Structure formats: structure tokens, C-alpha cells
Amino acid sequence: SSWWSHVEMGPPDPILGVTEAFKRDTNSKKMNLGVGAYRDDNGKPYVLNCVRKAEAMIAAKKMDKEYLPIAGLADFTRASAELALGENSEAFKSGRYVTVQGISGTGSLRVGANFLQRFFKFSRDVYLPKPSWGNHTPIFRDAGLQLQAYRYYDPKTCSLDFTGAMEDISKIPEKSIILLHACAHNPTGVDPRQEQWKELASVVKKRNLLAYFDMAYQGFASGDINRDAWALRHFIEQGIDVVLSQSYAHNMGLYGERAGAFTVICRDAEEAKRVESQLKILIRPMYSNPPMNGARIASLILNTPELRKEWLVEVKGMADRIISMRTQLVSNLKKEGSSHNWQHITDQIGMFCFTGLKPEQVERLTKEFSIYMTKDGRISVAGVASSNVGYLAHAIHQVTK
Amino acid sequence: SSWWSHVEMGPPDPILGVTEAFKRDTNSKKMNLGVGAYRDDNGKPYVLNCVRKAEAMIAAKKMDKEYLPIAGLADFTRASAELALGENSEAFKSGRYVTVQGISGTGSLRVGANFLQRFFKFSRDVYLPKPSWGNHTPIFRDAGLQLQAYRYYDPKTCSLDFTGAMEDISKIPEKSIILLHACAHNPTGVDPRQEQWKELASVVKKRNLLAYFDMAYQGFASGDINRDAWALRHFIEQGIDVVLSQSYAHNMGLYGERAGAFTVICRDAEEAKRVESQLKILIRPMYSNPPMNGARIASLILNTPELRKEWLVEVKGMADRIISMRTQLVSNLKKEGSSHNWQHITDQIGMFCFTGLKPEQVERLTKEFSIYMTKDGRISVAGVASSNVGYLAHAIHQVTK
Ligand SMILES: Cc1ncc(COP(=O)(O)O)c(CN[C@@H](CC(=O)O)C(=O)O)c1O
Ligand SMILES: Cc1ncc(COP(=O)(O)O)c(CN[C@@H](CC(=O)O)C(=O)O)c1O
């Protein structure tokens, strides 16, 4: 008996673990449809054009590698707030916000949760949608808060249970915390309608709840970044001071570089200055200062007019491709002779499809076809190419037939 | 009264805050001797030659930016363990270790502390040397452990209080946790002698204490990396299963890229496999997966023979330069006419000098000469160039005169 004789074998991550299992298969037709990672039409990792050029400017410039302030690159930080808020926004304009570079979306989310654990004195409860991204639970749980839930998806109907959502939300206790996905809800791919959003705003406002927005997919819901930030902006303009986490992993394909941010909307710039100070104190003993490569690339794209415009064409091109794969999948299914209604596939937005396959079917897909996906029936359509869409549809059909 | 009306203005970081204050001064002769960051002889940020070439290979290769496993780049991870352990080591050879990429030294340290908080069932007390790096306190405190102390430095004598250290250590309760700096203790620049180390080993072994080693400066104590890893290796070969955190921020000048690692020495490779699994579960909800740029550069240097050999010449050159600045400082002091004994300056090793100036003198230095240093009298000699060593010595002299 040594120090760790009692430490048990823990299980593999429900999402991340999918790539580990995928890595090992020798089937040359294998497809990794687990994690949400964009693939180009050859079904290959895609580094955006603007990223490649950003990198080149960085090189050419022969920049140092000195430590960044605890809060991140100022240019990156100011530019992210602006991307979420919009440049004409009163909040942005008045400087009633504090944005801090974070370790991608996950990193930002945990900085937020930790912040909240420490300073949100009105409650310990965070309300998550049913269902929500698997990692939201443990993020809030490790930070020290309690998890609760509100109704959201209706599997019978493959859409939003708006009556249920509103019931639950109208009953959450005042001053509690509610988490909302800004756009391209994960994993359902179903977002509230503008009108629907207008109504949630009212109830949140009315019950005096802290709204925590998770904005991991800005530009993937419609293909337009301002349009994808609507609800978030609408909330702030209604007088709701939200907290928000942003990720650049998918919309800029910076996955492993880990670039993201966490923002707090405050009452004044003076308030923002004191929040900033406490966020630095929290981050110092966590990881000291954040990773520079992803933030330098992102800042350069966002702040360089030609790079930004190129970026936006690129985000549009990515979203479009996802659409075409959705379309073709459905068509292939009909073509294979599938009886089922696959309309939800083309109805859903974002990088995935919440298919509805049962765990026995998910299991067969992996073992007979070497198609890896999460156990809840979620598949990343973003990772399908023109060359294997046929393979996918045949498989889905066989296991469903 | 809004959400954060009660959040107070927190103070600036005792080290990191020095660079913020330094940034603002308009004095063209200002010197930032706060944080430990190497400067070349022109007093400029220095990106190693091998780093520059590593970067170039990476570019040329047109690598993707896909997410890395939760534990890091395998090549980086295997190579770090090896750099600390030595290639002939039984521990390394037998695979009785688990190494996980971490967010530099700070990141690794917190992963460790968090791990310990969760799995070290024999105690909540971490013993720190007096004095220790300021950030060790809050790292352990935020993770949820209790801090204790053992005697270490003797200001009267400007050296190690070995009798005191041993007294205190011989009385720490069995199965408690003790933190030791592998080499170039921060901030004293005084390390135990080999013989001294031999004696600490015995007492740690005897009281069955968990030894936690902080190895932030491998190659800066002597200019030789194997020699700097001696004590750490000696402990493991005596049968002590330590835990350790490594940083590549200074020895590879990867500061802002944040490359580091956390290792656990276990009884078997099977044990290592279960520890690994729990470390992944801890990291997933923290930052998901780590930053790739620093780890790719480091892996390439460590695993490419010519790059490694170049690296070692470079580490030696850096250490040598620090020595020459130490020498010249002392000489300048005599030359200026200083009565005091400045021998500790040349006696200390690593990037700093624990000068002994009082806070009123530190204050004057900043206001009259614009020389920034921490309030405990610690100065980074590593940041002195041939051109301002004279300025420094004159200043020190004026304020000491
Ligand atoms: C809703 C949501 N929020 C935050 C994140 C955080 O992303 P990063 O930390 O990588 O910036 C993701 C990524 N969800 C992906 C990836 C994953 O789980 O790692 C998914 O497969 O659902 C996400 O879907
Ligand atoms: C003893 C010690 N351990 C760990 C670290 C962690 O370094 P990174 O997180 O940057 O890898 C440092 C850096 N101490 C420096 C830098 C600092 O405080 O940020 C110092 O000025 O003491 C250190 O001195």
C-alpha cells in the first residue's frame, strides 16, 4: 500500500473519449463524428486562409514570447467584447464591461463559475437546459455550485418545448443563475425563435435571475455573426447585465491553440475596474497568465480589416457546406430506401444533428461501420465530406432498417 | 445596488503587478527587474535560436490545429519526464510515472494541488520553506489545502539555516506534504548542498512525507541540466515517490506560450494508468485540453538531437551571462565606493539576487531611478545588460550610501 493504491480507474470522457477510441480502429473507412470539429470537403482538418496569413504576419514581425498580463492581450480582449456586443452598443461604448482572455470556452466558463462561487452571494444554483453539453455539469460542480434544470427539448416533436421551458423558468427562485446557449444549442441544434427569445428576456428580467450565456458557436447558426449574437444583445438592451463565455475554437478553427474570453456586464466602468481586479486575483493562482499564440492570431484577424472580411466569407463558406451535407444526408437516406422521417437533420442548425438513435444502434454503427459518435445519438455533420456522405447514409439505414 | 456592488478593489499582484507599474513610467533609463525574465546583453527579450528553428519546422510542415488529448502531446509528455528523471532511471524505464502537459509551471502546480486535495487522504497540510515564491500560498489555498512552514533562509548569514530546517522537518507529522524547490530556490538563490540534500532525503523517507518538487529552473543553478536534476533523482532512487511540476518558461524562454508538466511517481505502470485516468477527469472540467504551440516547439527541441544539443549550449550561454552580470555588479559597487558586503550577489545562483534592501530603499530606487523590483528586496539580475549594470550599481549605492 503506497500513496495511490486507493485511486480507481475512472471512465473515458463521453466526448473526448470518442476520439481516443476512434484513433485505434484500423478500418480505413472509419469516421470520427464525435467531437464537433470542422472538416473540409475532403474530410480533412481545415486551417482557415486568414489564420494562415495571420500566422505569417506574426512570423515576419519576429515577435517576442514574453508573459502577457494576467487578463490577456488587450487588443484581443477589446476585440472579443466588441464581436459579442456589437460596436454601437451602449455597454461597449460606455465601458461597463470587463473581458478577460480565457483558456478557450471551457477555460472562460470555469473562470466565470469560480468567480461566481466566490462573489455571487445570492445563490449556489445554476440552472441548465435539458439536455445541455455534458461538460457543463462538472464545470459548475468542480467550481462549487449546485446544478438544477429547466425543460428545453421535446424528443417526441424534435423541437423546443416552449410551454415547459417557460413554466420551469417562471418558477426558478429570484436571483438564481440560469445558463443559456447564445445560438446553435448543443446538442439539440434547436434555438428559440426571436419572438421566443423576447419572451424569455421578460421572464429573466422579471425574476431577477443572473443570465449566463455560453457563446461557443457565433456564426454557425445562420452563417452571419451579428445575427447569431442577437439574443445576447437583446438581453443587455432590455437591462439584463449578463455574464458570458466566448470560444474561437470552431468559428476560427483555433481548436488546440485555446483562445476564448469571459465577460461581465457591470453597472459602470468603475464597477468594471473592481471586478477586473478580483478576476486577476482568481486567475493568478490558477494558471498565472494565458496562452499567446491563439490570441495573437485572433486579434490580428479581428483588428485587420481585410483579414476580418476574409474571415467572414470563410465562416459563411463553412456553414454553407454543413448545410449541403445535411441536405445530401437526407437525400441519401431516401435513396437508400429509409422509411423514417429524417427532417430534423435538415431542420437543426450548427455542427450537429441530434439523430435520435438508441445506444444499441450507436454501438452497431461503431462495430460494423467504424462510425464513431456520442452515445446520446449526437453526430457531428460538420465532419462529413462529399465522399463519405453515401457511406454514412447506408450505415444509418442498415442499423435503422 | 446591482450584482457586484459589494466586490472590492483587490490589490495588484506582488510580482506581476511590478511589470504593470513599470510599463507606465516615462523614464527612458527604466529597468524592469521584477519578474524573472531573461534579457540578452542589449537588455532585450531573447527568443532562443533553437526555438526560432523549431517554429520554422512547424510552419514548413503545415500542421493542423486540432484538439490535443486531455493529457497533452505524447511526445512532449514522454520527453519532459525523461528530462527530469534521466533516461537510465528505473522509474522512467519501468513506466511507473504519469506525466500530463500542464499550463506552464503554475498550471501544473495547481493541477497537482487539486489532485492532492481530491485524492491525498492522509492530510490537508502543505509545508512551504521560509521564504518561498509568493504564488505558492494562494495556489495551495485556492485548491483547498492548508499551509504550514519550515525554516530555510537565514538573513543574518545570507544562507541556508540547515539546523532549523532539519529541526522543523524532523517534527512535521507523518504523511504530511512538503514542497521543495528542485534547484535555484526562489527567492533566495541558495540551494542545499549535495550532502545536505542527502540528509533531507533520509528525514523525508523516515517521516513518510509526500515530497512535492517545483522544478521551474532546470539548467539555471549550474548551467548543466543533469546536474540541476540531481536531488530530485536522488530522492526517487532512495525510494521516495515524489510528485513534481516542471516549467519551460525560463530554460526555453517560452514564457507566454505556457508549456509545463505535472508528474506523479507511482508503484507500478498499472497504478500510473489509474492516476492518469483521474487526472484527465480533473482537467476536463478545468480547461478541457492544453495549449499546443509551446508543447510542439518544446517536443521538437527535446526530441531532435541537433536541436537539443543546440539548446544545451544556449542554456549554458544564458547562465554564464547571468554570472558575468553578478560579477560586474559587485565590482561596480566597490568602484562606486560602497562599504557594504555584496558577496551574496555572487554567492546566489539562478536568475535573482535576494539583496536585503528595505522597503524604503526599494521605493526610492523606483521613484528616483525608475528601477522596478519586488518589495522583498528581490531583483532579477537576469534582466541586466552590459550597458545598465553601471546605472544599477550607482543607484544601489546612492540608496544604501
Ligand atoms: C456549448 C459548448 N460550450 C463550450 C464549449 C467549449 O469549447 P472549447 O473549450 O474547446 O473552446 C463547447 C465545445 N463542445 C465540443 C467540444 C468538446 O466537448 O470538447 C463538443 O464536441 O460538444 C461547446 O459545445
Ligand atoms: C519557483 C517558481 N515556480 C513556478 C513558477 C511558475 O512559472 P510559470 O507559470 O510562468 O511557468 C515560477 C515563476 N516565477 C517567476 C514568474 C512569476 O512569478 O510569474 C518569478 O518572477 O518569481 C517560479 O519562480
Coordinates of C-alpha atoms and ligand atoms in Angstrom, one line a residue, chain A residues 15-16 34-36 103-107 109 133 136 181 186 214 216-217 247-250 255 258 352 378, chain B residues 67 284 287-289, ligand 1:
Chain A
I15 CA -17.0 13.1 -26.0
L16 CA -13.2 13.3 -25.9
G34 CA -17.9 12.5 -32.1
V35 CA -16.4 15.9 -31.2
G36 CA -17.6 19.0 -33.0
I103 CA -8.4 29.2 -21.9
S104 CA -10.9 28.7 -24.7
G105 CA -14.6 28.3 -23.9
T106 CA -14.1 25.7 -21.2
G107 CA -11.4 27.9 -19.5
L109 CA -16.6 29.1 -18.3
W133 CA -23.5 20.0 -23.2
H136 CA -21.4 22.0 -18.2
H181 CA -26.6 28.9 -25.1
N186 CA -25.6 21.8 -28.1
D214 CA -22.3 30.3 -23.4
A216 CA -19.3 28.8 -28.4
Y217 CA -20.7 29.0 -32.0
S247 CA -14.8 30.4 -27.8
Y248 CA -12.9 30.8 -31.0
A249 CA -12.3 27.1 -31.3
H250 CA -14.8 26.5 -34.1
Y255 CA -9.1 24.3 -31.5
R258 CA -7.2 27.6 -27.0
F352 CA -24.5 18.6 -35.2
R378 CA -25.3 13.1 -31.4
Chain B
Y67 CA -7.5 19.5 -30.2
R284 CA -11.6 18.1 -18.4
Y287 CA -9.6 23.8 -19.3
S288 CA -10.5 20.7 -21.4
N289 CA -7.3 20.3 -23.3
Ligands
LIG1 C1 -21.8 24.5 -25.9 C2 -20.3 24.5 -25.8 N1 -19.7 25.3 -25.0 C3 -18.4 25.4 -24.8 C4 -17.5 24.6 -25.5 C5 -16.0 24.7 -25.2 O1 -15.1 24.6 -26.3 P1 -13.5 24.8 -26.1 O2 -13.1 24.6 -24.7 O3 -12.9 23.7 -26.9 O4 -13.3 26.2 -26.5 C6 -18.0 23.6 -26.4 C7 -17.2 22.7 -27.2 N2 -18.0 21.4 -27.3 C8 -17.5 20.5 -28.3 C9 -16.0 20.1 -27.9 C10 -15.8 19.4 -26.7 O5 -16.7 18.8 -26.0 O6 -14.5 19.4 -26.3 C11 -18.4 19.2 -28.4 O7 -18.0 18.2 -29.0 O8 -19.5 19.3 -27.9 C12 -19.4 23.6 -26.6 O9 -20.1 22.8 -27.4

